[PDB]
Amino acid sequence: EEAELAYLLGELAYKLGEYRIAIRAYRIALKRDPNNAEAWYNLGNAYYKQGDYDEAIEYYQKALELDPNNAEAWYNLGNAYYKQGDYDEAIEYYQKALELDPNNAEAKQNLGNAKQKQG
Amino acid sequence: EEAELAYLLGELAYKLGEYRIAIRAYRIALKRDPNNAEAWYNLGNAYYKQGDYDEAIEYYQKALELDPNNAEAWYNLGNAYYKQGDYDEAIEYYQKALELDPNNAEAKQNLGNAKQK
Amino acid sequence: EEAELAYLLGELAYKLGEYRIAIRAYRIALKRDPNNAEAWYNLGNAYYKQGDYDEAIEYYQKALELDPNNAEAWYNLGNAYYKQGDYDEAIEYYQKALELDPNNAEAKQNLGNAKQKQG
């Protein structure tokens, strides 16, 4: 229904790089369905893509409280910490991402980058 | 009104090559308005664009039950059969398309291709 | 809520050059929220982009009754009259546009074009 339409609009907007429109659409989705883990996750991505890492972190966290079994969320949480030079936290979350999804090449590369920093 | 929004979102998604999103949106439109022939037709196109010809066929057929006088639907039904090498069926539907719309070149070209196979 | 969704869809469609979809979406938005000046304005732009200048004019006019302090709207109203050869009206609205936004060099150029077309 309308929340699903809002969600689809946000995804479409996101995929086309219209992050402000994605955010406004995901907000409508979340107003209607506040416990939608995937909407929080995607709102997080939209903020991430705009360089707003603190907001991304907050919404990734919210998504993971609702659904901790989202490997990609753990991974992006890692990235957002990495981009702020919080290498400890990035390492913790990349590792959690890999515990859930050992095949995430990207998380493995970034884990390695983060481990090499820190020092 | 919600059905129209769903439909517009599906068209937008389709036009931009986001077929999965188009399908999900058109399904919401059809849930609200199951007699919308153009939504069935477009759902068909979205599946066609993804290479899922059997599904495309099913939805083209549904669209044509609702609007049998719609030459473009007959034409796309033809194409979907053609892409699966069902040349007999493609010929029947291209011909039906042309019986309704003697112009539209494309169905005429494809009819010729199919007949040659 | 539905009005906002319709509006977001219209914006998204507009930004991507899908003007027919934008028009249909903005119509739904305005049906739900007829006092949205920015929706009237954008419906106007969508019709303008399609070459439907009489419709553009109608919706610009509506937008400006609701928000007269929108300089860019006065300017586009001017353009739409210009494209139909209503040079008097184009001149009046370009002038109004400049009274509100003296830095609109485009409106100044077009004002000059219109003044020339009419002798």
Coordinates of C-alpha atoms in Angstrom, one line a residue:
Chain A
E1 CA 0.0 0.0 0.0
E2 CA 1.0 3.7 0.4
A3 CA 4.0 2.9 2.7
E4 CA 5.2 0.3 0.1
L5 CA 4.8 2.9 -2.7
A6 CA 6.8 5.4 -0.7
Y7 CA 9.5 2.8 -0.2
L8 CA 9.6 1.9 -3.9
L9 CA 9.9 5.6 -4.7
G10 CA 12.8 6.0 -2.3
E11 CA 14.6 3.0 -3.8
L12 CA 14.0 4.3 -7.4
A13 CA 15.2 7.8 -6.4
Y14 CA 18.3 6.3 -4.6
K15 CA 19.2 4.1 -7.6
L16 CA 19.2 7.2 -9.8
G17 CA 21.3 9.3 -7.4
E18 CA 18.4 11.6 -6.2
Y19 CA 19.3 11.2 -2.5
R20 CA 17.2 14.2 -1.2
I21 CA 14.1 12.8 -2.9
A22 CA 15.0 9.3 -1.6
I23 CA 15.2 10.6 2.0
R24 CA 11.8 12.4 1.7
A25 CA 10.2 9.2 0.3
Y26 CA 11.7 6.9 2.9
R27 CA 10.5 9.3 5.6
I28 CA 7.0 8.8 4.4
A29 CA 7.4 5.1 4.4
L30 CA 8.8 5.1 8.0
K31 CA 6.1 7.5 9.2
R32 CA 3.6 4.8 8.1
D33 CA 5.8 1.8 9.2
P34 CA 8.3 2.8 11.8
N35 CA 9.6 -0.7 12.4
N36 CA 10.6 -1.4 8.8
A37 CA 14.3 -2.4 9.2
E38 CA 15.0 -2.2 5.5
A39 CA 13.6 1.4 5.3
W40 CA 16.0 2.5 8.1
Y41 CA 18.8 0.7 6.3
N42 CA 18.1 2.5 3.0
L43 CA 17.6 5.9 4.7
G44 CA 21.0 5.2 6.1
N45 CA 22.5 4.6 2.7
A46 CA 20.9 7.8 1.3
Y47 CA 22.7 9.8 4.0
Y48 CA 25.9 7.8 3.5
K49 CA 25.9 8.7 -0.2
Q50 CA 25.6 12.4 0.7
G51 CA 28.6 12.3 3.1
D52 CA 26.4 12.6 6.2
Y53 CA 28.1 9.7 8.1
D54 CA 26.8 10.5 11.6
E55 CA 23.2 10.2 10.3
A56 CA 24.1 7.1 8.3
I57 CA 25.5 5.6 11.5
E58 CA 22.3 6.4 13.5
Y59 CA 20.0 4.8 10.9
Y60 CA 22.2 1.7 10.4
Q61 CA 22.1 1.3 14.1
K62 CA 18.3 1.6 14.2
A63 CA 18.0 -0.9 11.3
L64 CA 20.3 -3.4 13.1
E65 CA 18.3 -3.2 16.4
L66 CA 15.3 -4.2 14.4
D67 CA 17.1 -6.8 12.3
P68 CA 20.6 -7.7 13.5
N69 CA 20.9 -10.4 10.7
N70 CA 21.6 -7.8 8.0
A71 CA 25.2 -8.3 6.9
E72 CA 25.2 -5.4 4.5
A73 CA 24.1 -3.0 7.3
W74 CA 27.0 -4.2 9.5
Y75 CA 29.3 -3.6 6.5
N76 CA 28.0 -0.1 5.8
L77 CA 28.2 0.8 9.5
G78 CA 31.9 -0.2 9.2
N79 CA 32.3 2.1 6.2
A80 CA 30.7 5.0 7.9
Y81 CA 33.0 4.7 10.9
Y82 CA 36.0 4.2 8.5
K83 CA 35.2 7.4 6.7
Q84 CA 35.4 9.3 10.0
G85 CA 38.6 7.6 11.0
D86 CA 37.0 5.5 13.8
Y87 CA 39.1 2.5 12.8
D88 CA 38.5 0.5 16.0
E89 CA 34.7 0.7 15.5
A90 CA 35.1 0.0 11.7
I91 CA 37.1 -3.2 12.5
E92 CA 34.4 -4.4 14.9
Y93 CA 31.6 -4.0 12.4
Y94 CA 33.5 -5.3 9.4
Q95 CA 34.2 -8.4 11.5
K96 CA 30.5 -8.7 12.4
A97 CA 29.6 -8.3 8.7
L98 CA 32.0 -11.2 7.8
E99 CA 30.8 -13.4 10.7
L100 CA 27.4 -13.2 9.0
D101 CA 28.6 -13.1 5.4
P102 CA 32.1 -14.6 4.8
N103 CA 31.8 -13.9 1.1
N104 CA 31.6 -10.1 1.3
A105 CA 34.9 -9.4 -0.6
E106 CA 34.4 -5.6 0.0
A107 CA 34.2 -6.0 3.8
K108 CA 37.3 -8.1 3.7
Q109 CA 39.3 -5.5 1.7
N110 CA 38.1 -2.7 4.0
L111 CA 38.8 -4.7 7.2
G112 CA 42.4 -4.9 5.9
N113 CA 42.6 -1.2 5.1
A114 CA 41.3 -0.3 8.6
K115 CA 43.7 -2.8 10.3
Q116 CA 46.6 -1.2 8.5
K117 CA 45.5 2.3 9.5
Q118 CA 45.0 2.3 13.3
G119 CA 48.9 2.6 13.4
Chain B
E1 CA -5.8 7.8 -7.2
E2 CA -3.4 5.5 -5.1
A3 CA -3.8 3.1 -8.1
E4 CA -2.8 5.9 -10.5
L5 CA 0.2 6.8 -8.3
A6 CA 1.3 3.1 -8.3
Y7 CA 0.9 3.0 -12.0
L8 CA 2.9 6.2 -12.6
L9 CA 5.7 4.9 -10.4
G10 CA 5.8 1.7 -12.4
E11 CA 5.9 3.6 -15.7
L12 CA 8.7 5.8 -14.3
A13 CA 10.7 2.8 -13.1
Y14 CA 10.1 1.0 -16.4
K15 CA 11.3 4.0 -18.5
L16 CA 14.5 4.1 -16.4
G17 CA 15.2 0.4 -16.7
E18 CA 14.3 -0.5 -13.1
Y19 CA 12.2 -3.5 -13.9
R20 CA 12.0 -5.1 -10.5
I21 CA 10.7 -1.9 -9.0
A22 CA 8.3 -1.5 -12.0
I23 CA 6.8 -5.0 -11.4
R24 CA 6.3 -4.3 -7.6
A25 CA 4.6 -1.0 -8.4
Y26 CA 2.3 -2.4 -11.1
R27 CA 1.3 -5.2 -8.8
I28 CA 0.1 -2.6 -6.3
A29 CA -1.8 -0.8 -9.0
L30 CA -3.4 -4.1 -10.1
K31 CA -4.2 -5.1 -6.5
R32 CA -6.2 -1.8 -6.3
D33 CA -7.6 -1.9 -9.8
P34 CA -7.5 -5.5 -11.3
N35 CA -9.4 -4.4 -14.4
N36 CA -6.8 -2.0 -15.6
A37 CA -5.8 -3.6 -19.0
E38 CA -2.9 -1.1 -19.5
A39 CA -1.4 -2.1 -16.1
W40 CA -1.5 -5.8 -17.1
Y41 CA 0.0 -4.9 -20.4
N42 CA 2.8 -2.9 -18.8
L43 CA 3.5 -5.6 -16.2
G44 CA 3.9 -7.9 -19.2
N45 CA 6.4 -5.5 -20.8
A46 CA 8.4 -5.3 -17.6
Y47 CA 8.7 -9.2 -17.5
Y48 CA 9.5 -9.1 -21.3
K49 CA 12.3 -6.7 -20.7
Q50 CA 13.8 -9.1 -18.1
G51 CA 13.7 -12.1 -20.5
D52 CA 10.8 -13.8 -18.6
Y53 CA 8.7 -14.5 -21.7
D54 CA 6.3 -17.0 -20.2
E55 CA 5.2 -14.4 -17.6
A56 CA 5.0 -11.7 -20.2
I57 CA 2.8 -14.0 -22.3
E58 CA 0.5 -14.6 -19.3
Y59 CA 0.0 -10.9 -18.6
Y60 CA -0.4 -9.9 -22.3
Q61 CA -3.1 -12.5 -22.4
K62 CA -4.8 -11.0 -19.3
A63 CA -4.5 -7.5 -20.8
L64 CA -6.1 -8.8 -24.1
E65 CA -9.1 -10.5 -22.2
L66 CA -9.7 -7.0 -20.8
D67 CA -9.0 -5.1 -24.1
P68 CA -9.2 -7.5 -27.1
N69 CA -9.3 -4.6 -29.6
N70 CA -5.8 -3.5 -28.6
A71 CA -3.4 -4.1 -31.6
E72 CA -0.2 -3.2 -29.7
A73 CA -0.9 -5.9 -27.2
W74 CA -1.5 -8.5 -29.9
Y75 CA 1.9 -7.3 -31.4
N76 CA 3.8 -7.7 -28.1
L77 CA 2.2 -11.1 -27.6
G78 CA 3.6 -12.0 -31.0
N79 CA 7.1 -10.8 -30.0
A80 CA 7.1 -12.8 -26.8
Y81 CA 6.2 -16.0 -28.8
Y82 CA 8.9 -15.1 -31.4
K83 CA 11.6 -14.8 -28.7
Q84 CA 10.8 -18.4 -27.6
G85 CA 10.8 -19.7 -31.2
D86 CA 7.0 -20.3 -31.2
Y87 CA 6.7 -19.1 -34.7
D88 CA 3.3 -20.5 -35.4
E89 CA 1.8 -18.6 -32.4
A90 CA 3.9 -15.4 -33.3
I91 CA 2.4 -15.5 -36.8
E92 CA -1.2 -15.8 -35.5
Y93 CA -0.8 -12.8 -33.2
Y94 CA 1.1 -10.6 -35.6
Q95 CA -1.7 -11.3 -38.1
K96 CA -4.3 -10.4 -35.5
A97 CA -2.4 -7.2 -34.7
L98 CA -2.5 -6.2 -38.4
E99 CA -6.2 -7.2 -38.9
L100 CA -6.8 -4.5 -36.2
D101 CA -4.0 -2.1 -37.2
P102 CA -2.9 -2.4 -40.9
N103 CA -0.2 0.3 -40.2
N104 CA 2.6 -0.2 -37.6
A105 CA 5.4 -1.5 -39.8
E106 CA 7.0 -3.4 -36.9
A107 CA 4.4 -6.1 -36.8
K108 CA 4.6 -6.4 -40.6
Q109 CA 8.4 -6.8 -40.4
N110 CA 8.2 -9.3 -37.6
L111 CA 5.4 -11.3 -39.3
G112 CA 7.8 -11.6 -42.3
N113 CA 10.7 -12.8 -40.1
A114 CA 8.5 -15.4 -38.4
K115 CA 7.0 -16.7 -41.7
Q116 CA 10.6 -17.2 -43.0
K117 CA 11.0 -19.4 -39.9
Chain C
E1 CA 0.8 12.0 2.9
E2 CA -0.5 10.8 -0.5
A3 CA -0.2 14.4 -1.7
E4 CA 3.5 14.4 -0.6
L5 CA 4.1 11.1 -2.4
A6 CA 2.5 12.4 -5.6
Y7 CA 4.6 15.5 -5.3
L8 CA 7.8 13.6 -4.8
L9 CA 7.0 11.4 -7.8
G10 CA 6.4 14.5 -9.9
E11 CA 9.7 16.0 -8.9
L12 CA 11.6 12.8 -9.5
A13 CA 9.9 12.4 -12.9
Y14 CA 10.6 16.1 -13.8
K15 CA 14.3 15.9 -12.8
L16 CA 14.7 12.9 -15.1
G17 CA 12.9 14.5 -18.1
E18 CA 9.7 12.3 -17.9
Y19 CA 7.4 15.3 -18.2
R20 CA 4.1 13.4 -18.9
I21 CA 4.6 11.4 -15.7
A22 CA 5.5 14.6 -13.8
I23 CA 2.3 16.3 -15.1
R24 CA 0.0 13.4 -14.1
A25 CA 1.7 13.1 -10.6
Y26 CA 1.5 16.9 -9.9
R27 CA -2.2 16.8 -10.9
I28 CA -2.8 14.2 -8.2
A29 CA -0.8 16.3 -5.7
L30 CA -2.8 19.4 -6.5
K31 CA -6.1 17.5 -6.3
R32 CA -5.1 16.6 -2.7
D33 CA -3.4 19.9 -1.8
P34 CA -4.7 22.8 -4.0
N35 CA -2.9 25.5 -2.0
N36 CA 0.6 24.2 -2.8
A37 CA 2.1 27.1 -4.8
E38 CA 5.3 25.1 -5.7
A39 CA 3.2 22.3 -7.1
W40 CA 1.3 24.7 -9.4
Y41 CA 4.6 26.2 -10.4
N42 CA 6.2 22.8 -11.2
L43 CA 3.1 21.6 -13.1
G44 CA 3.6 24.8 -15.1
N45 CA 7.2 23.9 -15.8
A46 CA 6.3 20.3 -16.8
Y47 CA 3.8 21.6 -19.4
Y48 CA 6.4 24.2 -20.5
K49 CA 9.0 21.5 -21.1
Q50 CA 6.4 19.7 -23.3
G51 CA 5.7 22.7 -25.5
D52 CA 2.2 23.2 -24.0
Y53 CA 2.5 26.9 -23.4
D54 CA -1.2 27.8 -22.8
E55 CA -1.3 25.2 -20.0
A56 CA 2.0 26.4 -18.6
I57 CA 0.6 30.0 -18.6
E58 CA -2.6 28.9 -16.7
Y59 CA -0.5 27.1 -14.0
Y60 CA 2.1 29.8 -13.6
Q61 CA -0.7 32.3 -13.2
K62 CA -2.2 30.2 -10.4
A63 CA 1.2 29.7 -8.7
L64 CA 1.8 33.5 -8.7
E65 CA -1.6 34.3 -7.2
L66 CA -0.6 32.0 -4.4
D67 CA 3.1 33.1 -4.2
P68 CA 3.7 36.5 -6.0
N69 CA 7.2 36.8 -4.6
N70 CA 8.6 34.0 -6.8
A71 CA 10.8 35.8 -9.3
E72 CA 11.6 32.8 -11.4
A73 CA 7.9 32.1 -11.9
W74 CA 7.4 35.6 -13.3
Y75 CA 10.3 34.9 -15.6
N76 CA 8.9 31.6 -16.9
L77 CA 5.5 33.2 -17.3
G78 CA 7.3 35.7 -19.5
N79 CA 9.0 32.9 -21.5
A80 CA 5.7 31.1 -22.1
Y81 CA 4.0 34.2 -23.4
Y82 CA 7.1 34.9 -25.6
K83 CA 6.9 31.4 -27.1
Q84 CA 3.3 32.2 -28.1
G85 CA 4.1 35.6 -29.5
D86 CA 2.3 37.5 -26.8
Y87 CA 5.1 40.0 -26.6
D88 CA 3.2 42.7 -24.6
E89 CA 2.4 40.2 -21.8
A90 CA 6.0 38.7 -22.0
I91 CA 7.4 42.3 -21.5
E92 CA 5.2 43.0 -18.5
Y93 CA 6.2 39.7 -16.7
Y94 CA 9.9 39.9 -17.5
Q95 CA 9.8 43.4 -16.0
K96 CA 8.0 42.1 -12.9
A97 CA 10.6 39.3 -12.7
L98 CA 13.4 41.9 -12.7
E99 CA 11.7 44.2 -10.2
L100 CA 12.0 41.2 -7.8
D101 CA 15.3 39.8 -9.1
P102 CA 17.5 42.4 -10.8
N103 CA 20.3 39.7 -11.3
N104 CA 18.2 37.6 -13.7
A105 CA 20.3 38.3 -16.8
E106 CA 18.2 35.8 -18.8
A107 CA 15.0 37.8 -18.2
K108 CA 16.9 40.9 -19.2
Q109 CA 18.1 39.3 -22.5
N110 CA 14.6 38.0 -23.2
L111 CA 12.9 41.4 -22.3
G112 CA 15.2 42.9 -25.0
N113 CA 14.3 40.2 -27.5
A114 CA 10.5 40.8 -26.9
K115 CA 10.9 44.6 -27.2
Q116 CA 12.6 44.1 -30.5
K117 CA 9.9 41.7 -31.8
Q118 CA 7.4 44.4 -31.3
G119 CA 9.1 47.5 -32.6

